[PDB]
Amino acid sequence: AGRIASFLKNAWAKEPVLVASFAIGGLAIILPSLSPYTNYAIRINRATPYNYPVPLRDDGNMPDVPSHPQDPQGPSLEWLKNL
Amino acid sequence: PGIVELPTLEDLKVQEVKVSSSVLKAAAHHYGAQCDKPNKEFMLCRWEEKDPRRCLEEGKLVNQCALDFFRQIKRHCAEPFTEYWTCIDYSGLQLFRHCRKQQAKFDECVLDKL
Amino acid sequence: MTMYIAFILSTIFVIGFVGFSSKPSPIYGGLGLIVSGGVGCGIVLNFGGSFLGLMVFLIYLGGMLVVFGYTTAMATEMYPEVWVSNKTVFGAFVSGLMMEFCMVYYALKEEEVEIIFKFNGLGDWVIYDTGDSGFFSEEAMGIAALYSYGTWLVIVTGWSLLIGVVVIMEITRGN
Amino acid sequence: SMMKWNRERRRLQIEDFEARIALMPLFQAEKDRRVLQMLRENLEEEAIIMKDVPDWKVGESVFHTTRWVTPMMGELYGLRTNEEILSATYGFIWYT
Amino acid sequence: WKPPPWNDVDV
Amino acid sequence: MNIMLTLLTNVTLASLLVLIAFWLPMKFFLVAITFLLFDLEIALLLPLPWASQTNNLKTMLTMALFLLILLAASLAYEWTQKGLEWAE
Amino acid sequence: MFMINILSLIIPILLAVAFLTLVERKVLGYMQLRKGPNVVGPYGLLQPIADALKLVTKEPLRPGTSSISMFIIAPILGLSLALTMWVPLPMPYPLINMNLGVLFMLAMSSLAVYSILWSGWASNSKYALIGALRAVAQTISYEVTLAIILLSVLLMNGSYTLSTLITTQEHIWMIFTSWPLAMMWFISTLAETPFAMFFMAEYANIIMMNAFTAILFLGASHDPHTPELYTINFVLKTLALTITFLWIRASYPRFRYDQLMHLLWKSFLPLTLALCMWHISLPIMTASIPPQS
Amino acid sequence: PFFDVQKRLGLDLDRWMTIQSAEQPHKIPGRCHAFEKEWIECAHGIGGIRAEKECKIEFDDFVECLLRQKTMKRLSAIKRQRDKLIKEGKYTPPPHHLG
Amino acid sequence: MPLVYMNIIMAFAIALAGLLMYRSHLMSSLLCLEGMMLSLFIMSTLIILNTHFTLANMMPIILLVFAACEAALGLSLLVMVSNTYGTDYVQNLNLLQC
Amino acid sequence: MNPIIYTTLIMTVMSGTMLVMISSHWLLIWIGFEMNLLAMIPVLMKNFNPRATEAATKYFLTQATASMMLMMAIIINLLYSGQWTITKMFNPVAMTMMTMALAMKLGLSPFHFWVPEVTQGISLQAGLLLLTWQKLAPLSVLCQISQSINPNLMLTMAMLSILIGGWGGLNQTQLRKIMAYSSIAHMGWMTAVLPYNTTMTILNLLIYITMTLAMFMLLIHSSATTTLSLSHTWNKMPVITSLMMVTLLSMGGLPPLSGFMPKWMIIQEMTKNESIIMPTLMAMTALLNLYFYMRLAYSSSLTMFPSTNNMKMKWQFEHTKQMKLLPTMIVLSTLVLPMTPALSSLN
Amino acid sequence: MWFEILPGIAVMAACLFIPGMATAHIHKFTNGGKEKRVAHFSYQWNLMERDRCISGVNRYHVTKGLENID
Ligand SMILES: CCCCCCCCCCCCCCCCCC(=O)OC[C@H](COP(=O)([O-])OCC[N+](C)(C)C)OC(=O)CCCCCCCCCCCCCCCCC
Ligand SMILES: CCCCCCCCCCCCCCCCCC(=O)OC[C@H](COP(=O)(O)OCCN)OC(=O)CCCCCCCCCCCCCCCCC
């Protein structure tokens, strides 16, 4: 209490620069694993299709994959639409 | 050390689609929707067979359906096609951003006409 | 023919090296090296090495070689020497030209000389492929994977750089 | 403001990519025919130019395996106008 | 030749 | 074709201007090394804009932060042990 | 006609390099109750012609102990550089839309240190040797702040393609997201910047630095059809910056070297690192990573 | 490695980049990916002594793809006779060759 | 193997020979040092780009960033040997006769 | 050097060497050698005397030259095979190119002129590091590529090293020069058997290593830098010279003193490979190392030498160093001949 | 008076303005209407080469829409 408050007062009086850079780096390296958006960031990164989605040989029992890009099956990008 | 088999010129004759890139990109979205099966089976040949010579007839089909896809849009609202792709072609990046009203003037046919 | 871009930059690279390898003045050696570094970018750029090429222009040209100019200026020998000061410098200069003359002329005539390796070789434009990079720059994705696939190369590279700092100050400390 | 605009660009990019994906297969067929057409023309010229040679029968497989090696840029065009080689080889790299 | 020094020290 | 053409004419006008101009009428080395070591660290963290679009972004954030933490440590060390302070 | 476009850039920039000097002297003049050049032509309009042709008629004396080869190629590079980084500027549509324009700008602008380094060495004088040594260390100190600022700026842009900068800003000036960096960037630009040449070399650097700062932080809206909108906005923004660049020329005592290094390595570099750390995670923080393509 | 510590703890330190047919970013393939895949798959669990001789054509074809040596000289002798044949007017290029 | 590929290779050989014999100057010796890595950086760059080794493009930049650790240590040794002996002349490095 | 700085400095030298022994990628190998050089120089530049600056400059120039010469050899291997693994290289030019680069960093062939001088200028304690720990990583790589090594080149490297190792040591008086020339001769001994058997190279490594610290750290405890200065050790520390003499006898390779174990097994392994002129020549010239070994042994313990009046002062005080690992190093380097079948452990 | 600066700044403002206007106008001219298509990736470039090939006059900016196909 007494030591830390004086120390920050000791720091922030003579120099504001390093305490500013230490603070800005402090949030910049802590906050990564706090907000529920880094999961969003990697999801839209995975969403962006660079290479072609090469089709699979249909032989029955894969209801997951669709038979047409208009089919409801497969991944839905609507989560990013409101994002 | 082996014959490099190459199909003759006669088999290499398709009704090549004579359209620019901008017109291709303008109708690309509806192209993929209504003509997936030709393309889908052709590139499955390209990835399964992994040989250009093994996939020729499917190469015929994709272009043929492209012409079959490029005929009705001539028959129905060719003029809205012109205005859309003549504004798409202006953009150096073919930016879809500065083409919205003309895009709307395109798909409202195919919504009700096609 | 702009087809000469094949060999023109590469042969200038050789004469750039002979310029400073023959030990001219350290300022002049810097001039010879940066010239070779300058044209060396052209070969990489003509191969698609925009990012890698410009980095040579950044750290090798605007970095590494500048600090050499700093050290050489600090040395400031009472009598700086010139490319004509020693005939050995000229003798090596004519020599280095002669070997590259032999290689180039042998290359352009018989195309099948046998120095060290098999040599051979037409204009370089062949070795390129006929594929496409799609929408991703193949080079940019390669180096962007430094933080994705190379999370061990980074540690040893980073650790040595910090250790590079500690050694530099340790031996220049002067006690 | 940058947060909202950047996501808008990402939605724009994937739509642009969607156009490229939906439109890629036509060029794959088109590039497929082009290289095979260019190869067939090269071999046809080979069957006109080179007879006096002792044993250089046309269409020898340089690679032992019977696969399809992707044609390297040299023998693809090769016997064409030097402008064609310059435009095909450097091209994109020089277009700026 | 001479033997080395014993301690190795040579505005 | 286009690039060196722009370079060629640029120096040529530089050439014609100067030609008619002269025809018509330890501390310094120390930081220079630290700049060198810092500059090479700069090149390591240059490809970041493309690296921000990877699929393994979770391991990117720790790794990309690691350079800046470690690079700052070199500055912090260099500062503390006299060093980075302008020597005499 | 592409060659004509080069002359349609190099010469007017050369004239632009020539003609803001009268702006400088008259701004610097009217600032100190003075008038500036106003007797030679109307309001000094012909003052630049009054000095240039005089300079070319002045004999270029050469030091006896001067290496002629370096003494004449150092200005060659100095002018060649000063008129080369004007080529990839995304001014309406750039002459060269290099996908790595920012890197090219930095590598070739960091090459200017060779000209001053060679000038001091080739001159071979006690004044010239230290002055080259001081100038280069001041310069080579300041790309690390330059590079980090530009790197950390471009995380929220998308790539090094200078043309993409316009799309990134569009809605708001990019200063509103990185104004701590703008003052970080602007100050660093001040210090980084035969004898008849050396006027031209550093001077185009002065305007282009502000042109570079203009596109980077204070963007405009480039209407696809009418390009004049971006032309006027770009010129007006880079004029206001340059007036500010000379506004501070006669408003502060000049920096001293020990503070000059102390200011960067102890009060500019560590803060630049923090902002870079802030701007590397924030696109990830808010899932606002930009598209490169 | 002399001491395969990475084999024991099972973490990849330098095997991601040691060969060109690994998990490349965004699945951009190497130029000789197809040939390297055959050579590696042929020479697995065989040992250096046996695999160097047994899987020889795989290595030679992959080397030719990697270096572009033998088929390049095929092209070199293609142009060699061409310049030695059309110069004295023995044959003329067809229109598609001319452009 | 194309003509240019061994235009770098000889350049490395010339740079190696220049470093393998000293004329009078340690700075000039150092200049051939990172000249050798320049060709080494250059030579690797053609290989990786030509072969489409999509993941090996790492190697060039780290080849440069690690050759710098040699260079940075390199001159920093010379500044020591050129402040006791005063001159970077390498013939003054014979004090270790015995 | 602040001990925390020095400790971390040593730590990355070991890490740099350790990285070499555990890296499959060729590039990581060059990194480990690069880090090792990057931190070896400051350790040599710890005393900060002109000889140290001379030695560090020589060491850096030859090591950095071989480091990037090594890097060139890897690229040629990449140029001809597109590989990065350490299994067996695919280009004969690269085989010799890297063999030259690797060998120069060990100082055995004509690429050895730095070794006597670099250890001479630098301090004794840092010399122990140079001639023991900096000699595992290049040897580690060589064992891994022993399949593709060129016997004609490699054995010519071995013959010259042993010949120069004995001949050079005969004419030296500075005991640091004695150790380096002995080390070069030992290096030729181990380096001759890589084409035949890597395991025997390893055994020659540990025995030579333990022997060097045994000799070097005993020299540290005696605090001597010349043969004359070593002579006076008998008066102050008679015990030290007693074990130091038996270490010299073992260093020659006289049974049953261990140190004959590597030479014995090296001869036996080459003899199985129908190479019988080669073992004889190295064995015959191995006696050359014994001559200056006896010469050093003669004027340290066997015959007392004229001491000095001030030496009486040294008797009153006692050593402060705890001579860690000294005792078990002597025994492990002088009596382990009966425990030779431990060769199987290395395999 | 302070407004005498403007004649100084105006001419160089035109001197700075000309490079932008000239580049945009020549882009509209040499590309005939549509601006110079930008190819930052090999995909856009091979698109342009397809446009030049399909034009039949070796001019990429010549575009053949619905009137070309049958
Ligand atoms: C959620 C928020 C995240 C981000 C938060 C960021 C941190 C909070 C804000 C921090 C402060 C603002 C950003 C950094 C500014 C600089 C910091 C710094 O070191 O300042 C002290 C520095 C140094 O001051 P000093 O040297 O007296 O003291 C520094 C501290 N000690 C004593 C320990 C060294 O100030 C300067 O360098 C003075 C200016 C030098 C240049 C002279 C010309 C100035 C012209 C000014 C007018 C024009 C401005 C144009 C701006 C751009 C326009 C496009
Ligand atoms: C392989 C062939 C042989 C190779 C080795 C040969 C070794 C001898 C020759 C070495 C070469 C040089 C010539 C000799 C030089 C000797 C110099 C020397 O230091 O001599 C004097 C020295 C003084 O010793 P000091 O410190 O007084 O201690 C005496 C014991 N308290 O003297 C000493 O330090 C000697 C002290 C002797 C102590 C030995 C203790 C032995 C204990 C045995 C215990 C046995 C227990 C048995 C139990 C049985 C039931 C289990």
Author numbering:
A (entry chain 1b): 1 to 83
B (entry chain 1X): 1 to 114
C (entry chain 1J): 1 to 175
D (entry chain 1Z): 49 to 144
E (entry chain 1D): 28 to 37, 73
F (entry chain 1A): 1 to 25, 53 to 115
G (entry chain 1H): 1 to 193, 219 to 318
H (entry chain 1e): 1 to 99
Published text:
A key group of these are the respiratory chain supercomplexes (SCs); these which primarily consist of complexes I, III2 and IV (CI, CIII2 and CIV) in varying stoichiometries, which serve as the minimal functional units for NADH:O2 oxidoreduction. Here we report in situ structures of porcine respiratory SCs, determined directly through imaging porcine mitochondria by single-particle analysis combined with cryo-electron tomography (cryo-ET). Our structures, with an average resolution of approximately 2.5 Å and local resolution up to 1.8 Å in the best regions, enable in-depth study of mitochondrial respiratory SCs in their native states.
To investigate the effects of varying levels of ischaemia on the atomic-level structure of CI in native mitochondria, we exposed porcine hearts to room temperature for durations of 0 min (‘fresh’), 40 min (‘mild’) and more than 4 h (‘harsh’) before mitochondrial isolation. To further investigate whether there existed intermediate states involved in the transition from active to deactive (A–D transition), we performed further focused 3D classification targeting the regions around the Q site using all datasets combined, resulting in seven main intermediate classes. The comparison unveiled two distinct classes (classes 0 and 7 in Supplementary Table 8) that fully conformed to the hallmarks of the active and deactive states, respectively. The closed structure, characterized by a reduced angle and tight interactions between the transmembrane and hydrophilic arms, corresponds to the active resting state, whereas the open structure is indicative of the deactive resting state. Consistently, our study also identified two main classes of CI, namely the active and deactive states, characterized by the closed and open conformations. In the fresh-condition batch, the active state predominated, with an increase in deactive states upon incubation at room temperature, indicating that the deactive state may arise with gradual depletion of substrates.
